[PDB]
Amino acid sequence: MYLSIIILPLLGSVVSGFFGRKVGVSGAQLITCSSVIITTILSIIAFFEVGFNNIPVTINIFRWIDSEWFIINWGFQYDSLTVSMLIPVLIISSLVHIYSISYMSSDPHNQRFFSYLSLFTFMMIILVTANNYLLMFVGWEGVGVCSYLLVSFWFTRIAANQSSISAFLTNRVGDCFLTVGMFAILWSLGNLDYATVFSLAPYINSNVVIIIGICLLIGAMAKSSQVGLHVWLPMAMEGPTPVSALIHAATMVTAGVYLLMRSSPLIEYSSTVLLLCLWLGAITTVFSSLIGLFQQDIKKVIAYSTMSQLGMMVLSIGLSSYNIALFHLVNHAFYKALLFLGAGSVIHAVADNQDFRKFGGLISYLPLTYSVMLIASLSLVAFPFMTGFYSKDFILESAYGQFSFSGVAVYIIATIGAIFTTLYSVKVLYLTFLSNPNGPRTYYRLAIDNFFSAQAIKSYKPAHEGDFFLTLPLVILALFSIFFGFITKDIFIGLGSNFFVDNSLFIHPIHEIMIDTEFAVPVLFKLLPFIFTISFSVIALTLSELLSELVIYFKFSRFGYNIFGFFNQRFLIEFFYNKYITNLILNLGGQITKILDKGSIELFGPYGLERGLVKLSKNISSLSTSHVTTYALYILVGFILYLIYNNLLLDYSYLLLIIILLLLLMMIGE
Amino acid sequence: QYDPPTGWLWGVRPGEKYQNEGWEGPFFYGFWGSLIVFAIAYAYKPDTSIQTWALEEARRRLEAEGILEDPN
Amino acid sequence: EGLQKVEVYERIKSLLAGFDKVNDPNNITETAHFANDLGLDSLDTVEVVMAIEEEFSIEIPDKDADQIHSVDKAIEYILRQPDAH
Amino acid sequence: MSLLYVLLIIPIIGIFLISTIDSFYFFNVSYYKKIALITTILNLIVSLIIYILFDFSNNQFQFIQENLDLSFYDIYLGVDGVSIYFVLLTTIIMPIALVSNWNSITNNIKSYLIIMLLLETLLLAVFLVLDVLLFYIFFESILPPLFILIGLFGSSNKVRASFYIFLYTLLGSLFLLLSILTMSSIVGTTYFDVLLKSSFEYTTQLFLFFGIFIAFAVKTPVWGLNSWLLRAHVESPLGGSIVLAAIVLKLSLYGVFRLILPILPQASLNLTYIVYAIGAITVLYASFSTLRTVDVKELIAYSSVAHAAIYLMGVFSNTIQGLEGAILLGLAHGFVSSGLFICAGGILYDRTGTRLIYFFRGLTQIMPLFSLFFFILCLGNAGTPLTLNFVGEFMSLYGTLERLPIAGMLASTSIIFSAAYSIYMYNRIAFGGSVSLYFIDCFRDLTKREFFILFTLVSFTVILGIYPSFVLDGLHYNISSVVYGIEPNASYLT
Amino acid sequence: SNRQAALSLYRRALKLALDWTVHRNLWRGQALYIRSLFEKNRNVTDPRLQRALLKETEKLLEKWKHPDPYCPPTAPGGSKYERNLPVPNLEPPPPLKF
Amino acid sequence: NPPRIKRQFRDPHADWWDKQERRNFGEPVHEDHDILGMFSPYEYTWITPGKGLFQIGLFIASFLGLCY
Amino acid sequence: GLQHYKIAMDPALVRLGSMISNRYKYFRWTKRTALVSFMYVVVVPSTIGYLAYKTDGLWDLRAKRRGDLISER
Amino acid sequence: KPNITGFDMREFLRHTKTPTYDPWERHEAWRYTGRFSRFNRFKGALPGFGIATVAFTAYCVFEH
Ligand SMILES: *P(=O)(O)OCC(C)(C)[C@H](O)C(=O)NCCC(=O)NCCSC(=O)CCCCCCCCCCCCC
Ligand SMILES: CCCCCCCCCCCCO[C@@H]1O[C@H](CO)[C@@H](O[C@H]2O[C@H](CO)[C@@H](O)[C@H](O)[C@H]2O)[C@H](O)[C@H]1O
Ligand SMILES: CCCCCCCCCCCCO[C@@H]1O[C@H](CO)[C@@H](O[C@H]2O[C@H](CO)[C@@H](O)[C@H](O)[C@H]2O)[C@H](O)[C@H]1O
Ligand SMILES: CCCCCCCCCCCCO[C@@H]1O[C@H](CO)[C@@H](O[C@H]2O[C@H](CO)[C@@H](O)[C@H](O)[C@H]2O)[C@H](O)[C@H]1O
């Protein structure tokens, strides 16, 4: 069974991709969807199997790489952390598959699309079920190849081809650092298996753990889209909406977080990386909360919301409460997938327009979508007793619960980042559903009012909700977004819970802050995020509905003109990357090609020896005039030079100077 | 309203058939045939790797210690 | 399948009908001229083509917008675009 | 006779039959091309027979013949795990190299087949010889057939391309000859068994190193000395390009396991920082200038320079892992570079007559089978996992880091830069917009010939990526013999 | 010249207004104000001053340019632009052998 | 050599032969054609590099001061 | 050789590709080309080589545990 | 000091209002009426609140 969870998504991908002609769009959709539905059911069972019974499962198939001290197997371990990740990965993958039957119905290439969906699920399973870091890297690269294949699904569009280059190469930068980090592990311990690395971790050189932890963290920025290497994640919104719901906001983005959570038995022995994890987390939350409030694309806002939540989990990891980060990771993939599938539904209704400035009303036209995205937005802001309430609000009070400067700092930073989250959540829900209509009448012209006479049969197209294959995922994910946090709060938060007591999430007694977070933190800071959400939400509603002039005053002031464009342009990080990193590399390639390879390497080489020697040989060849009188003089000359050399006992070097002088005199013309 | 499946595999139009250029005979029977016959033979190749030899000695040294249990 | 002449005409007729700068709603036909048949200024016609652009969610380049000086020329242009909603 | 001499006679017998068939019939060129192809398959069947019998943990050379008669120059053939996979690679490529270029030659077809059948013997010999002067004899006997292969069946800039390869390879290899002659003078023979026993004085080693490395640096090739390859590979016919990249570029890689690792160890150790400095530079510069190359076939050739540098730093690691990774990356390069050359030189050039990346766009829309294989060969060039190219790079890069960490850290940047050019080339030909407008008429997709050699080459790259132990179990014991070093408690046992 | 140029600037300044002011009611009042400023200069004749008022308008269109101007979805710069662009040559390949 | 101008600053609505690339069939090409086309790194024209460093400094100064 | 399909060969791109191919025939030694050539061929390799020599055998990570130092030398 | 163009940004913002007379007034009047009046837009901004409030009071009265 366990090895069958791994195998099923792979087989459905192969049928849809290499045999799409035989099965057709219907047969590809059925085999692809059914295989991942079956895998999802087998994985829910494996959660009861492994986690609730504390029975880890080991299976090794054959060796991959065999050398001295290097034995890396095609082996898989199922523990409490593995089955925890598999549930959001396979529930969301199953639902996005069912969703994609309705969303991609009109597209010409459905077999290729559904094949890439199953290929992504297979690779994500490989990433969380591996025995060792090198097989986890296969899923890491595999998910990257699948994200490139899905961002660039519409290859005809150049924008898509630029954005897929960004995703591929910004993730290769993280891969370089993981490869260095895995080299460090092999160099120190001789093998990179999890049992080996974690059993020996308490004793390794403390500075060796620094090198591995930094390399593991740098690799984690690229995939988890942390501020240093995050430019790719918003560009991955070029691919179709269901791709952005699973890969770009509910599964692959979390792999960086999984890498740190898996490596907890190692990075816990280096508090130096834990400060970097923590500050890395707090920066990305305010960095991306500010940007999303000034975006005009709905997908761009929901992409910048995901990076604000990924920054929350990395903050929790550096806070040294891994069960909290795992709890947020699973809870977030339910409501972030909901908002993306809900946004995808309004894009479908409004003729593929993705701009808030052209959406209005629509609340009466898309009632289910509005309520469902209201479900998602209340857990995104962690409204009390929602699924996101138990995960996001425990990260905040755990930051203040570690009574340190860095903890109180990140609490202030993260709380401000939460304020801007509430602002762009109102923006999305107000401008798409609650504001006056800002788009053409075609989305709002019904048949109850007669605008036509001889064309009443057709041509109204008034923004209707989709079909069963579209709404069904949205309803299910809504139920998760309301109740999943409560029903699983003990498995993850607990107080002395033993769910991860198979060393899947190792907390060192020195770093435990759980008891203080339960008792030490004052009620004011415990309740503080709630008042801010309720107060800002009403303030932004009035400034968007009642008092709409004031924001016009801000953006028409030169101060606010610069502040609006600064955050709209994403801190100008894209600007400085193309101009000083990307273009710098393309100039360097040109200078090597133009001035060195085709320049001085051929001048101080074959071409300069060619043109130099041909000139020399013509001059010496011009000494031969076929005159016996002049040839006789040469013999006497060459006779005397031999007599001088072997009678004046001259230094042999004096001769070589003569030859080099003579040769270079024939090198000069005229 | 899905369309019929289409295309010309190998560029052979729906009228005619694939014309054998000449390479096909040796390449399918000799080149690939040799690899399947090599694959089936490789299964019965005796294992003369250093590790199968070094594992068995290594087990007999660790069996002389509490690290590995001996069947005797 | 695509856009029809009667569908585009009904929408532009209602567009110009709701514009106070037309001399009369009655004399707006398929072959109506903006400058003299409808009596519109050189800036009112620029506003008109912007309203037509909003109605069909398309873009009118400066080269093409200068050509639109009558209803029929506008009707033809919208149907010459396979991108209008 | 031995079984290693049967490897050499069969390609010679095929040369004879192509030359004499016209004397029994005006014969078709299709009959000449079946003889050459059946001859290369038989060499591949013998080589698979040799591999079945081969002992994976034996320190004696195998399948040797008792000469018992000594002359001034005598051919001595033997096989060790270090050389068996180089022989197999030569015998899998040569059949595909012929099939790939089956229609593209058209004129002088007998001459073309005779040169390849002659090249197969000379490249097979260079791995089978058990002397270092005999190694040099065949490592340089390939230069006259390759001068005439490029000149007779090459592209427009063929004359200069063929002069570059011959003169650079002749010049570089004449510094190797001086070093070999010195070792023979001091020891009295170049037979490996007698030379490997002998230990040279450090100063002799440091000057023998200067002369074997100068040869290898030209033939790797390193960055400031790679001009011949940028000309040779591009202007060469498709078949010549496949041989030169997959098999000839590996002669220097296999020559370090014979001429440097076992007989000049102190020199290799004290000079590795010079090797690594060069290897690091040729990783960066080659990769920066592969990004701005506008000829597709010359973009595949430049990619080879960056990969050879990873395997060169791997052979100089004094580590078991980097040495086996170097051989794996050379085997991996043999399959992937062959496929990318087939795509650029044998599918695009066949249909367009152009190699300029300006003219290609959206080729996936009309040629979906080409784009699938082209993507897989681009990913392997990028060292993606599940391909043998990833295993070789990882082991080559780890031994580089364990030897001198800083240089392996720069060399690890190949993970970002090989990816950069591979995807950028891919997105500009297969993707990048709709089918170009420079294509007046539609292009057909892959032929059953083009498909099945691309599929065969991809199949070797992926299967060997999954289970590299097919090649790793043979090299372990024999690689163990080229490591220099001791451990304080494992050595000098009593 | 000097007419379609001033009409291009009139349409442009009305798009920049709707881009910054997202609400159409509010932009409606802004739109009447920019007309008044074009209609205030309908009797300028000499090219020395005619082209100065276009040059200085072009400065105010850059001075207040939007970081992300609205683009219709199927327009160049739009979300669905070039999404399933058809092959520009549907004719079967000419009969050549490779 | 023509001016080294990125073709993203050309008119997308001109009667281009190749509309996707914004090019005509005979027009001269800069020697840097590779990295001047529509499939090349983007050019952001929001503000000047010098003014951008200022505004990046003001963000940092504000965030360091909050830490202070 | 074999007839290829018809390509609308752009005279502008054909002469550009010809320019890139014959470009070396026009390289000169200027104050600028020497400065770029000296930087790339001498300075960067000499800097990389110098660090390679100074840090050679400086560190080893194998089996090093707490209480041991990474530095060999 | 004033520009040659009559544009003043202070006066521009003063006119950022709903104009008293508008030539396009009737063309845009559909966006503020009917389904798009103030009440109608926010009539169902909280979908299940009304049904849930009365239902929760029924559960809340459990003393009797
Ligand atoms: P009809 O043919 O009757 O008239 C059309 C025009 C006006 C073109 C006539 O042909 C004409 O008289 N031409 C002369 C053009 C001229 O010199 N002056 C006319 C006005 S040009 C102009 O720009 C006027 C000033 C406008 C200032 C506001 C626009 C910019 C605002 C900033 C951006 C938007 C806010 C953020
Ligand atoms: C994975 C690829 C990279 C691996 C190779 C790079 C490893 C880098 C290791 C750096 C640390 C090496 O070992 C480190 O050396 C520094 C000096 O430089 C010394 O550091 C020492 O500094 C002070 C003196 O100034 C000592 O009092 C203190 O006890 C210690 O911190 C120690 O000897 C050791 O902490
Ligand atoms: C380490 C430094 C270098 C090591 C040694 C490498 C030296 C290589 C030098 C080769 C010089 C080129 O060699 C010379 O090239 C020219 C092309 O320009 C050839 O010239 C030929 O090609 C031209 C191209 O237009 C044609 O007109 C015609 O086919 C012929 O004249 C010469 O036949 C050849 O002798
Ligand atoms: C990484 C670099 C590796 C280099 C390996 C060794 C390469 C060969 C070394 C010598 C190369 C020949 O070097 C070249 O010689 C000839 C001498 O006539 C000169 O060639 C040129 O001289 C001057 C330019 O200065 C010209 O006006 C003249 O037309 C031409 O003959 C070049 O100045 C020199 O660059």
Ligand SMILES: CCCCCCCCCCCCO[C@@H]1O[C@H](CO)[C@@H](O[C@H]2O[C@H](CO)[C@@H](O)[C@H](O)[C@H]2O)[C@H](O)[C@H]1O
């Ligand atoms: C050390 C020297 C370098 C060695 C390098 C290897 C060179 C190998 C060359 C192959 C032998 C020569 O190859 C020889 O080519 C000539 C071309 O005129 C052929 O001769 C024939 O060719 C075609 C065949 O239809 C006829 O049109 C032509 O009239 C006739 O001469 C021979 O049948 C072939 O055997």
